[PDB]
Amino acid sequence: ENLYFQGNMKQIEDKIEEILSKIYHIENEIARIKKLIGAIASKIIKTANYTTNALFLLNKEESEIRDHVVEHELALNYLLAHQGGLCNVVKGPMCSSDIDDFSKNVSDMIDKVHEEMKKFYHE
Amino acid sequence: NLYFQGNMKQIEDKIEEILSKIYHIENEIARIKKLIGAIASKIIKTANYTTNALFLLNKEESEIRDHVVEHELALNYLLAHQGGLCNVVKGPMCSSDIDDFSKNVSDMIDKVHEEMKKFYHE
Amino acid sequence: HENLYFQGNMKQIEDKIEEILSKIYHIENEIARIKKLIGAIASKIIKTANYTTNALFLLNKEESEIRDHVVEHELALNYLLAHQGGLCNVVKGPMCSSDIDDFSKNVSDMIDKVHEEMKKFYHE
Numbered sequence A: 001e002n003l004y005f006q007g008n009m010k011q012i013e014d015k016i017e018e019i020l021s022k023i024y025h026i027e028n029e030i031a032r033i034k035k036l037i038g039a040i041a042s043k044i045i046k047t048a049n050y051t052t053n054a055l056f057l058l059n060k061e062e063s064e065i066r067d068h069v070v071e072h073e074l075a076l077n078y079l080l081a082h083q084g085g086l087c088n089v090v091k092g093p094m095c096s097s098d099i100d101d102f103s104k105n106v107s108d109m110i111d112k113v114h115e116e117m118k119k120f121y122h123e
Numbered sequence B: 001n002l003y004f005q006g007n008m009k010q011i012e013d014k015i016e017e018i019l020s021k022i023y024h025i026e027n028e029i030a031r032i033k034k035l036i037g038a039i040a041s042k043i044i045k046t047a048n049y050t051t052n053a054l055f056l057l058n059k060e061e062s063e064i065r066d067h068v069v070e071h072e073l074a075l076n077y078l079l080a081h082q083g084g085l086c087n088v089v090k091g092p093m094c095s096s097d098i099d100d101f102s103k104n105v106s107d108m109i110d111k112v113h114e115e116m117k118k119f120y121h122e
Numbered sequence C: 001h002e003n004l005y006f007q008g009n010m011k012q013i014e015d016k017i018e019e020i021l022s023k024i025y026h027i028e029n030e031i032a033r034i035k036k037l038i039g040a041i042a043s044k045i046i047k048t049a050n051y052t053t054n055a056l057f058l059l060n061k062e063e064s065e066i067r068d069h070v071v072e073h074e075l076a077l078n079y080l081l082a083h084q085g086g087l088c089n090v091v092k093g094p095m096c097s098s099d100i101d102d103f104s105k106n107v108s109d110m111i112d113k114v115h116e117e118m119k120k121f122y123h124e
Helices: A003-079 A103-119 B002-078 B102-121 C004-080 C086-090 C104-122
Strands: none
Touching: A003 A103, A003 B002, A003 C004, A003 C086, A003 C104, A103 B002, B002 B102, B002 C004, B102 C004, C004 C086, C004 C104
16 A cells, blocks of 8 residues: 555665666766876877977987088089089989978977977866 | 655755766766867877978988988099098998988878878767 | 655656666766777877887988998098098088087987887786
């Protein structure tokens, strides 16, 4: 007689207890997702930093090497002054055309990566 | 009688606690999606600057290489009587050629670019 | 009177418990799509770092060889222009015949360190 309020309230209480179980699972899941995202952000910063260091050193050495090759070419055109220069002695499809200096443009790409990482410290 | 009404109060209270928990959850999911997208965007932007830097190092390296190889020929000429370069400088591997990896590096840049294309499909 | 002030309530309690089980179901779906998405981001980081380090590795190796050959040439051009004061007197530079930095080991160091970060993705 009353039983049709006891048993039905019973099924309510057991089911509410499941909802708290499901909520519990979910919470632990979310705290772990946040953990993993933090750890991913961290790997990104460190890799960007390692990579950019490597680019900085490649760039600086490239610029030094270029300055040396520029001077070598001069001192070869001088030693070949009798024989029309390199443009005339080694004979390529273009041969004598200048060497691009991309040190500033690469430094600017390093700057942009560094700017992007500063961003990770605010989000 | 009051056992029924009182237990109904308890249940309604638990629903109130549950629905507020679910809300904070939904707020946490919204903050997480914001972060994952912001992260994706930094990866793409970073990777772009990076391969742009790689492109320009590789291009100039290959140009530098072209001139050095010509410079060796021009020097080997100017030193022919004394056995070219690899007799007047003396080294355990003087004559070892200079690798030209410019196409392998371009292939890598293509691969980074192809990986970043796939971000626009999620 | 007496009988509805129980039944009506229980039905709205049930119907709310219905919507809760629903909102939960939808949350669990969003969580699964977030987890997959993090998984693809991590894979895209590992792959992109791998290609970038391979490019660095090749740029570095060839840069080293070039530098070795430029050093040779510097000595050769100092032998040829010697009676005229070497290369530093003839070329005229505020530094001119400066030494060339050799950062190959420092670059390889950075390569190692990236491989090291990427290793840890296999350990989580």
